[PDB]
Amino acid sequence: IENSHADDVFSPNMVLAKSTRDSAQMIISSLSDVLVLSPLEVLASWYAADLLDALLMESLSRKVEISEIEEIISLCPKNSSIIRHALLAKLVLFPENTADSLNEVLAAYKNTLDLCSQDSVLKINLSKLFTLHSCLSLALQRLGYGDVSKRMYQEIFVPDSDADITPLSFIISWTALNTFAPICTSENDVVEKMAMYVRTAIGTLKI
Amino acid sequence: VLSPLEVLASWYAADLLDALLMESLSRKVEISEIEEIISLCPKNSSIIRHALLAKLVLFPENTADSLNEVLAAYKNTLDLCSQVLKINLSKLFTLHSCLSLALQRLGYGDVSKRMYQEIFVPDSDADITPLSFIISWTALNTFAPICTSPKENDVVEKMAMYVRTAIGTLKIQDLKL
């Protein structure tokens, strides 16, 4: 229970060492939401979280449309945690909207940074590094620079086998493996390592 | 986990490396001096990467072959990092702009400018090392005649105010001695 229970120990936040309490009570990206996010916007961020984790798993069985993502984006809060992941989902799940999408991602990140120094150390784990890593290369293959996007995909550090594996990072790692399964042969280690990442991860209901 | 011999090797290397970066600004620099550095730097340390990022910037025909190692050391520093990252704003910006610089020197232009235009230049704090300065200087140089054209959203202004405060604090930190 992560986005379910873990999302609770965060509802009380209406200062960095404060949140290690969560560990004893039982991911470090949603910790940032305590510095400036209403006690309400915490719970709104929770519902938009669960609403996105459910929307990504339906993107494999059914054909899904942007109207469902913009619902999650407006449902989300101004500058939250899940507002950044929602845009990534948009950048991954819709190639016809990558240029406009890539801007909205890099703007929401150029924004998260400005209101970190002007109010300053980053908190990223390897799984969310690999997540942004792949999501960019996939976004740049779709923009024609694949003469570059291949060589970037070649040097991706892929995590190992563990319980932690949000559906956002799964959908990216899956759709990126597919979009690079043919081009990458000319190194080739990534496709095999990335495909093993997906095969090794499967805690999903038959849909 | 480093012994007591390699800690001094890194301090000695870090001073020579800082010396080579500032010397490269008013003298003609080469790699022959960096080979001596990286070999002097112990085999698995932060100074390795700083010696590499300096080699990436200071040697432009060697971009292709020095970008190889910059990624190798970072994919290797990531390799043992699991078998949680904590990166600084200026560290991000340094890597950010250093890659933008390395890509323009490759022939991406568009991809080089767009990454350059999304650089998040730090405000103006104490995190000013001759390496971060040398990168921002040479990157401002090789990009000021390209990103200055499209007019609307650019960091050219923010980038130049960074190098202002750079040699502001380095020339003044050196003048006290």
The residues spanned by each domain of chain B are 5-82, 89-175
What span, in angstroms and rounded, lies between the C-alpha atoms of A179 and A151? 14
CA neighbor of A169 nearest in space, from A201, A140, A141, A192 = A201
Please state, as a whole number, how many other Cβ atoms lie within 10 Å of the Cβ of residue A22. Answer: 17
Pick from B85, B89, B111: CB nearest A113: B89
* Resolution, expressed in angstroms to one decimal: 3.5
Beta strands in A15-103, from DSSP E residues, in sequence order: none
Would you report the helix, strand and coil content of chain B in percent, each value rounded to 5? 70, 0, 30
Q: State the number of CA atoms in the 13 A half-sphere of A177 facing the CB.
A: 19
Q: Phi, psi at residue A38, to the nearest 5°?
A: -45, 150
CB A18 within 8 A of CB A55: no
CB B103 within 8 A of CB B63: no
Q: Which pair of tokens denotes residue A181?
A: 């399964």
Q: Under an 8 A CB cutoff, do B89 and A114 touch?
A: no
Longest dimension (CA), chain A: 53
| DSSP line for B81-137 | HH--B--BHHHHHHHHHHHHHHHHTTT-THHHHHHHHT-----S-S---HHHHHHHH
SS3 (DSSP) at A141: helix
Q: A-contacting residues of B 101-120, CB under 8 Å?
A: 103, 108, 110-111, 118, 120
For A151, which DSSP code? H
What span, in angstroms and rounded, lies between the C-alpha atoms of B17 and B132? 12
Q: Phi, psi at residue B69, to the nearest 5°?
A: -75, -35
CB B55 within 8 A of CB B66: yes
Q: Phi, psi at residue B96, to the nearest 5°?
A: -50, -65
Q: How far is CA A90 from CA A65, A86, B28, in A?
A: 10, 6, 48
Please report, as a single letter, which amino acid is at residue A92: V
Cα A161 versus chain centre, distance: 18
Q: Phi, psi at residue B164, to the nearest 5°?
A: -50, -60
Residues in chain A: 207
| Residue B62 burial by Cβ neighbours in a 10 Å radius (0-12, 13-18, 19+) | middle
Q: Does A189 touch chain B (CB under 8 A)?
A: no
Q: Which pair of tokens denotes residue B46?
A: 């932060």
For residue B92, the chain A residues in CB contact (below 8 A) are 113, 122
Exposed e or buried b per residue across B22-45, where buried means at least 16 C-beta atoms within 10 angstroms of its C-beta: bebeeeebebebbeebbeebbeeb
Q: How far is CA A101 from CA A86, A174, B79, in A?
A: 11, 19, 31
Q: Phi, psi at residue B85, to the nearest 5°?
A: -85, 150
Terminal alpha carbon distance of chain B = 33
Judged by phi (left if over 0) then psi (alpha if -120 to 50, else beta), residue B28 lies in beta
Q: After which residues is chain A broken (C to N over 2.5 A)?
A: 14, 26, 119, 186
Q: Does A155 touch chain B (CB under 8 A)?
A: yes
What span, in angstroms and rounded, lies between the C-alpha atoms of B54 and B134? 8
What span, in angstroms and rounded, lies between the C-alpha atoms of B53 and B42? 16
Q: After which residues is chain B broken (C to N over 2.5 A)?
A: 83
CB A20 within 8 A of CB A6: no
Terminal alpha carbon distance of chain A = 21
Longest dimension (CA), chain B: 53
CB B105 within 8 A of CB B60: yes
CA neighbor of A171 nearest in space, from A66, A91, A78, A82 = A91
For residue A148, the chain B residues in CB contact (below 8 A) are 103, 108, 111
CA–CA min distance A190, chain B (Å): 13
| DSSP line for A95-109 | GGGSHHHHHHHHHHH
For residue A129, the chain B residues in CB contact (below 8 A) are 78, 85
Judged by phi (left if over 0) then psi (alpha if -120 to 50, else beta), residue B152 lies in left
CA–CA min distance A61, chain B (Å): 33
Please report, as a single letter, which amino acid is at residue B177: L
Q: How far is CA A206 from CA A3, A58, A87, A161, A202, in A?
A: 21, 11, 26, 21, 10
For residue B85, the chain A residues in CB contact (below 8 A) are 122, 124-126, 129
Q: Under an 8 A CB cutoff, do A117 and B123 touch?
A: yes
Q: Which distant-in-sequence residues (6+ apart) come within 8 Å of B2 by Cβ?
A: B10, B42, B45
What span, in angstroms and rounded, lies between the C-alpha atoms of B121 and B139? 12
Q: Under an 8 A CB cutoff, do B86 and A129 touch?
A: no
SS3 (DSSP) at A121: strand
CA neighbor of B135 nearest in space, from B17, B9, B11 = B17
For residue B126, the chain A residues in CB contact (below 8 A) are none
